Amino acid sequence: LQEEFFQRATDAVSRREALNGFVALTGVASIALFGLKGASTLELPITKGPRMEKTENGKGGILRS
Amino acid sequence: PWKQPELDPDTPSPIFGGSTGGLLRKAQVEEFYVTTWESPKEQIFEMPTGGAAIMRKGPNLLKLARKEHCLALTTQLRTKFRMSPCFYRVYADGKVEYLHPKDGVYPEKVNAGRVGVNQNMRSIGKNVDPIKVKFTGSEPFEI
Amino acid sequence: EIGPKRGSLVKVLRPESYWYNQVGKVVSVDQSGIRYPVVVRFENQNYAGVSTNNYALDEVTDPP
Amino acid sequence: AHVVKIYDTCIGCTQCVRACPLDVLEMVPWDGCKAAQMASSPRTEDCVGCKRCETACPTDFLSVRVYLGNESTRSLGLAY
Amino acid sequence: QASLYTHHQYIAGFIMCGAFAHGAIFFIRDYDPEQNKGNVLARVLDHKEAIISHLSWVSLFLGFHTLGLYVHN
Amino acid sequence: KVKIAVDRNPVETNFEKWAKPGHFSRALAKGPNTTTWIWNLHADAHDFDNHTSDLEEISRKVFSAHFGQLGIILIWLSGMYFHGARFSNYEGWLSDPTHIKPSAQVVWPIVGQEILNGDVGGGFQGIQITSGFFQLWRASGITSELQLYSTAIGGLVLAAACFFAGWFHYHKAAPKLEWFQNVESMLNHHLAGLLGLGSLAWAGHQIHVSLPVNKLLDAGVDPKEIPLPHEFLLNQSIIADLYPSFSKGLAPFFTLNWAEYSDFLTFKGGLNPVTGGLWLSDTAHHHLAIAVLFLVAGHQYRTNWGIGHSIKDILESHKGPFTGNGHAGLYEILTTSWHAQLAINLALFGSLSIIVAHHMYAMPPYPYLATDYGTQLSLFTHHMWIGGFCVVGAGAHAAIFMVRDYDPTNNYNNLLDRVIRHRDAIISHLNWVSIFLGFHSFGLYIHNDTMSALGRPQDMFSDTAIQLQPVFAQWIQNTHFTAPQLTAPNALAATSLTWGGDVVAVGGKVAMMPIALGTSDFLVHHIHAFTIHVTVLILLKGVLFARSSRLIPDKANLGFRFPCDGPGRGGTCQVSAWDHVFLGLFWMYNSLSIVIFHFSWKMQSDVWGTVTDSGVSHITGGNFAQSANTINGWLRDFLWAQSSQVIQSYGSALSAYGLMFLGAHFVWAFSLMFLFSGRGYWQELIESIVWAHNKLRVAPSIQPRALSITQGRAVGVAHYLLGGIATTWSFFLARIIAVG
Amino acid sequence: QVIQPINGDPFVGMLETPVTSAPIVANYLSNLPAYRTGVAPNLRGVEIGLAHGFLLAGPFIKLGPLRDVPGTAEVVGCMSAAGLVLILALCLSLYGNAAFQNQPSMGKKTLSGRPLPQDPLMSEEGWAKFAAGFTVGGLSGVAWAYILTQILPYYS
Amino acid sequence: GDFLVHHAIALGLHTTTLILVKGALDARGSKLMPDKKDFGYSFPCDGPGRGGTCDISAYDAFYLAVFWMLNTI
Ligand code: CLA
Ligand code: CLA
Ligand code: CLA
Ligand code: CLA
Ligand code: CLA
Ligand code: CLA
Ligand SMILES: CC1=C(/C=C/C(C)=C/C=C/C(C)=C/C=C/C=C(C)/C=C/C=C(C)/C=C/C2=C(C)CCCC2(C)C)C(C)(C)CCC1
Ligand SMILES: CC1=C(\C=C/C(C)=C/C=C/C(C)=C/C=C/C=C(C)/C=C/C=C(C)/C=C/C2=C(C)CCCC2(C)C)C(C)(C)CCC1
Ligand SMILES: CC1=C(C/C=C(\C)CCC[C@H](C)CCC[C@H](C)CCCC(C)C)C(=O)c2ccccc2C1=O
Ligand code: SF4
Ligand code: SF4
């Protein structure tokens, strides 16, 4: 009884073609979700921005930007 | 030699403990080498891949992974106890090949029964330049 | 008989030899008709460490 | 495997076959040297290219030459 | 300007090293001495020891005295 | 059974073999046809195994070699004593050790070297020394330069005696092989006699000489009016006032009343607050206990009178089931192979030198040594490097024994044969643990570097962020701090101030203060464990695979030191055990360099410094806790925050340290020519130079040849080690003298 | 003599040790799913993937970049563990395509003879089924490790 | 100082030229190995015989010359 549930779990993905397609689909779906919707909901510190930081540069004068 | 000898599986083996240096998976999927020698008494010899073992009084059998191990053992036996051994090659399918004494008199002798192979009658350095054999598939030394 | 005198200095013109354009002393010349019957001895060793080598009749000349 | 070639400069000192721990070289009768011997390499495919025969060669230049290339499971000295 | 100069100088050095390497490849692979006998190429190959020795002399002299004056100062 | 077997006059004393430089080897006895003959002459000079196959001649040769080395060491020690007697400010340093820098080398005013004679104080100019000889000459009671002169003359006399002893014991009366094979007599005489008698003699010298001089020295008494040690030795009245136990006069010793000697044979923990070193009474009782413990240990083995222990019986008696035969043939191995004994002795000597470095940075045994940061750092680093070199040499000579002196007939199922049998398992497990240690010791550093560079210090492996607290080391520190309370109730204080709670300070500078261990200390200690595990992996793989291997089964017939077996099997370069040791030198260099960098940074950031009324300020403001978690932090705050005095040493007394620094950079960089390159290119370049010298007939009779592949590797590793050692030496000494 | 090679032959490498000759170790290794020859590759793959995907969720939740964020550390750790499980499943499928494009010619030759004809694990479609079981076990174990942080009497 | 570092630059150029030129001219033949042209441009060595033939090919000459080029630039 226990083996049957997992046998039917595997039977749809038993072929290496099927499992390669499944892992490819899940990988591209998860990567596309990340950044587009994966970021800015976890408050990832790449999609937030500065407050008022680091406009000037050059400690030896000239004061670019 | 006079007649090519076939190895016997009934010959005993020298007394030896478990050594991590020895046969590997290559002995199964690919060929492996078997060395055979006849001893007059029980002596102590060093294995080319392990420690020290005591050979038996009479025929002996050693299985080694490479032909270099077999010839190192052969040279050690000939230098130490003038054993004059011989080694075979057993393939994965069971084919047994005779390697070391093809003429039975060792490569040091000639026996006047073997032909010349890969011999150039020209001098070394008289080979043509690679430009002369370019796009031909043959090296200057292969001519 | 067919080569240089034994003990006479000869010059080796073999290009691939270590002693090209060098002077060696003849120690023996074979009379059995072999490929390189002239045997010479050099005072300076090669990289292999030997001091004697064999050359043909056309590879040895009298040095000036 | 590798290519092992013996030239006519060999004089049959039969020590190149002793220095080779793979039984690649063999001594055949000849007539171009005083010793009436010549090195031959029937089991060339068993060679690894260790150049011990070239070390043992007394002729200048070397009578036996070993050329590397086209490595195999026996030319690479692999026990696995 | 510093990055541009450093980039193009390292590129030039690597390219000159490749030039000499491929010239060596020409000399070993597809050089036919009987095709051009006695020309500038065969004559340069004839006294190659002189060229190499003089390059070694000028390099050794430059390095000896440059390091000597640098260590002295 | 044990007797003195000596052969008289085996070798004539003449200069016949001095005329011909190549005489020990039959290969070098012909002549120098090639230029590699000279390198083979200077390389096979002391290799006595291939000179002759007789063990007796080898034993005599190494006996007189040890005699010559002893004479050389005595000459050097006498020279140091002479330098302290003549060109030194030792008399000035005795009256003011906390303000006058030690100096024992005086340079000549010939060319610009007058700037090297720095103002070390006391009206004296010279090189500020770093060997700590002034501290040693203050520990042993030495007041005037006359006593140093006498010590130098006695050392020269003993050096001449040792050289004459070597000449006699080789050329005149050479011992036989059975004389050297008396292992039990050698062990008894070097346990009870050498070590025990020296410990007793030094204990007596400390009790009768060093204790009163040091008791008067730290009491403010000037050394001019301090009585000479012979007055203490002869007169019991003068020694009685300083130590009242001397009034009894050896009565408590024979009556077992040793508790009466608790004034000059004390058991005290910590350091003397006046000087900063260990108490001399503690050292006296220490060396007395060591003398007793070695005198009882030197009567263990059986030599001639029935009683005692047989080493062969002891070895053959210890046999446990998972080891087959246990220690069955080791007695025959160590009584017939000089190289196995050399390996064991070199390994233990190197390890004990490491112990010496650790236990004298921890507990300074000399007065005014802890405050002298330069002497302590130099001693720690020097004995660090000597121990590492001795351990690498132990691996080398073990591999040499494995190649040459090993015989498989004597040992079949002993420990050594089973070690060769499962060598692949040992090497594989050592490789696994090496890679695991490398990852979880260096990837932590790289990760901390990244999160610092990613602006995320809260993700660090640091104390402020999530941490790896060394709980075991801190628990051992707490146990040793509380050890005098319960487990050693007769100790006055803790055995060292590494784990203590008090900050001793002499002259306003911290002698020794408690050391706090944090995440960075954990990281560096595990890096040390990784580096030592990799180095021992390399050395043990070289030792184990010296005889044979799955690649080259006939590696034993190729000798110990051979360059390669050719480009076969993909290329068997550096396959010999010698090249394994050649890589081991570099790996020990890396290990000990990181170790001494850790030592210098940890001392300068958490121990060494100047004490103030408001707290204690270190040399560097505690940067090890917050900067040793990253490689960039290590770089910027140790190799760049320091070394600013080496570059700015020009025009000052330490300019020679900057010169040594840049010359060491040169020698370290010059080594990589011999390391990356091969021999064929250099041989062809030499051929071109030979053509050039042939053109105008200046060809040398000896043919110029390139250095051998093993010779080239040896030159490369030697120049690399020399450059790195001198680089660290110059940087460390200039930093610790210009600041500390 | 406790130390000896297996089956009394010394020419082999691996030798019989009390680490391996202990009955507890032998029965633990024989009863592991990877060495259960009589079971289908997908079932042992399911068990192996369940165990490995359950253990892989731990370090990602505990030491993740958002470990200080309450309520989102477990989600991020579990989805990163599931992504790692998918990466290992891709590795398993690639290894099955690689190492089993040919056909084995010999059995395993177990102790005292009695060898099975062919291990179904060592085939191409057998290893594909093993990888399928591995990834099914991996996501199911990851999902179980997530909800074990959802109901909790202690810590997570 | 400009003139001294210019001489250092000339030293680097001269040494790189020396090694590259020597590798190019000895690519096909040498006194240590006359038959270098038969072994290809990029081969490891000829073995431990004849004293030792490590880095004997012109490829290794280029490989050692890249270090000198990097130092010069
Ligand atoms: C910074 C380190 C360094 C230094 C100083 C050198 C120096 C040298 N190499 Mg180079 N080399 C190096 C690194 C270095 N190499 C590295 C890393 C590689 C890559 C493997 C190479 C690869 C290489 C090749 C391939 C070649 C050189 C060559 C040379 C020479 C060039 C000639 C010259 O400039 O005049 C001499 C330069 C000097 C710096 C002189 C150094 C000697 C001084 C005067 C001290 C002499 C001893 C002194 C008096 C003290 C005596 C006691 C002491 C010996 C104990 C010179 C000896 C060429 C050569 O030798 O042919 C001519 C050559 O073909 N090298
Ligand atoms: C090896 C180390 C050493 C040495 C050399 C000494 C030496 C000395 N100690 Mg010390 N001592 C030591 C260790 C040592 N001690 C240790 C470890 C302790 C334990 C803490 C002590 C504790 C101690 C105390 C408490 C006292 C001494 C005292 C003495 C002196 C008296 C000698 C004595 O009692 O025996 C000498 C007795 C002998 C039988 C020795 C015989 C030796 C003679 C010289 C033989 C000569 C024979 C010769 C061949 C014939 C004549 C030759 C002629 C031609 C010139 C002496 C200078 C006492 C002192 O200071 O008095 C002034 C004293 O009170 N010692
Ligand atoms: C446009 C100029 C040019 C051209 C047409 C060629 C063409 C050729 N050269 Mg030449 N060469 C050049 C420039 C050029 N090279 C330069 C600039 C150098 C100096 C660096 C060399 C040095 C050189 C040597 C020494 C040899 C050749 C060889 C060859 C042949 C094959 C090389 C090849 O593709 O292997 C493909 C090689 C690779 C795919 C390996 C790429 C690895 C690169 C080189 C290392 C880069 C470092 C690092 C990994 C980069 C990434 C950094 C990371 C942080 C991302 C071919 C005839 C070989 C030949 O003729 O065979 C006998 C040969 O022996 N050349
Ligand atoms: C108690 C007696 C005794 C003592 C003190 C020593 C002491 C020593 N022996 Mg040993 N040895 C002894 C008995 C003794 N031996 C016996 C009985 C044998 C034969 C079984 C040996 C066989 C032996 C060998 C084979 C070797 C030594 C060596 C050494 C030296 C080791 C180097 C060292 O640790 O630096 C300590 C250094 C010093 C303390 C410097 C001072 C050295 C003085 C001058 C030596 C005085 C001790 C001597 C025994 C006095 C009597 C000699 C007399 C004829 C004049 C050391 C001096 C090594 C060596 O050659 O060095 C000499 C060595 O290789 N020993
Ligand atoms: C207890 C000490 C000890 C003893 C008795 C021996 C004895 C021996 N060793 Mg061992 N060895 C030791 C320590 C020792 N070694 C240590 C510590 C190391 C690690 C570095 C080694 C590494 C080692 C190797 C790798 C080899 C030996 C070999 C040998 C043998 C001959 C050595 C020889 O002729 O050198 C000749 C002497 C020299 C070349 C002089 C040394 C000069 C060095 C290279 C440079 C020193 C520079 C100096 C530090 C600073 C000067 C700067 C400069 C500007 C002036 C002999 C059996 C060799 C052998 O064949 O064994 C049988 C061998 O291959 N040993
Ligand atoms: C600092 C320079 C350096 C470094 C880093 C290495 C690194 C290595 N050497 Mg080497 N070594 C060097 C110089 C160096 N070598 C030199 C100059 C010599 C000549 C004497 C040797 C001689 C030598 C010997 C003789 C031996 C080694 C061994 C090793 C290995 C040790 C494995 C380990 O524990 O470290 C852990 C691994 C590292 C430190 C590598 C960097 C890993 C960082 C932390 C990144 C982590 C992985 C990263 C996240 C993945 C990125 C993925 C990306 C591609 C997308 C490793 C491959 C030994 C070996 O084979 O293994 C024990 C060995 O036996 N080396
Ligand atoms: C107008 C003018 C002028 C002039 C100038 C001139 C005249 C210049 C020149 C320049 C030059 C004159 C340059 C040159 C350069 C060169 C080089 C850079 C080279 C290179 C080479 C190589 C790389 C090679 C290669 C090879 C080999 C190795 C072999 C064979 C092949 C080949 C050829 C490919 C003056 C100053 C008066 C003033 C101002 C203006
Ligand atoms: C540093 C030095 C020096 C100096 C000084 C000295 C070293 C001196 C001397 C010293 C000495 C001189 C020592 C020793 C002493 C003595 C002793 C150590 C003793 C002992 C004893 C014992 C052990 C025992 C005894 C006994 C008893 C108890 C009882 C009765 C019996 C008897 C007798 C047995 C010199 C210059 C030389 C050299 C260089 C270095
Ligand atoms: C440079 C180099 C050489 C060439 C080096 C040689 C031949 C040794 C040269 C030693 C010299 C001759 C010692 C003396 C140096 C000076 C002449 C001393 C000057 C002293 C002043 C007082 C004048 C090799 O032979 C070699 C071999 C294998 C691997 C790498 C290399 C390698 O890198
Ligand atoms: S390279 Fe080695 S294996 Fe090959 S023929 Fe020569 S000596 Fe024999
Ligand atoms: S490069 Fe040198 S060390 Fe390596 S196999 Fe060739 S000759 Fe030997």
Side-chain angles (χ1 to χ4, degrees), chain F residues 132 135-140 202 206 214 270-272 275-284 286-287 356-370 375-376 379:
Chain F
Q135 284 81 1
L136 168 70
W137 302 335
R138 202 181 165 102
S140 55
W202 181 249
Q206 282 203 318
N214 265 131
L271 325 165
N272 178 36
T275 67
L278 291 171
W279 300 87
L280 275 66
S281 57
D282 304 343
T283 67
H286 181 80
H287 275 105
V356 154
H358 264 273
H359 287 178
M360 318 198 339
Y361 95 82
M363 317 150 270
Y366 296 122
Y368 304 97
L369 181 83
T375 62
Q376 260 207 124
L379 279 159

Side-chain angles (χ1 to χ4, degrees), chain E residues 9-20:
Chain E
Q9 280 279 62
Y10 272 105
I11 280 298
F14 268 113
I15 285 180
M16 296 279 344
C17 262
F20 271 104

Side-chain angles (χ1 to χ4, degrees), chain F residues 563-568 571-574 678 709 713, chain H residues 44-49 52-55:
Chain F
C564 76
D565 208 4
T572 64
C573 295
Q574 293 184 7
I709 318 151
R713 286 157 189 170
Chain H
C45 73
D46 210 16
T53 47
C54 320
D55 296 21

Side-chain angles (χ1 to χ4, degrees), chain H residues 47-59:
Chain H
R50 309 193 314 277
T53 47
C54 320
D55 296 21
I56 206 186
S57 82
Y59 174 77

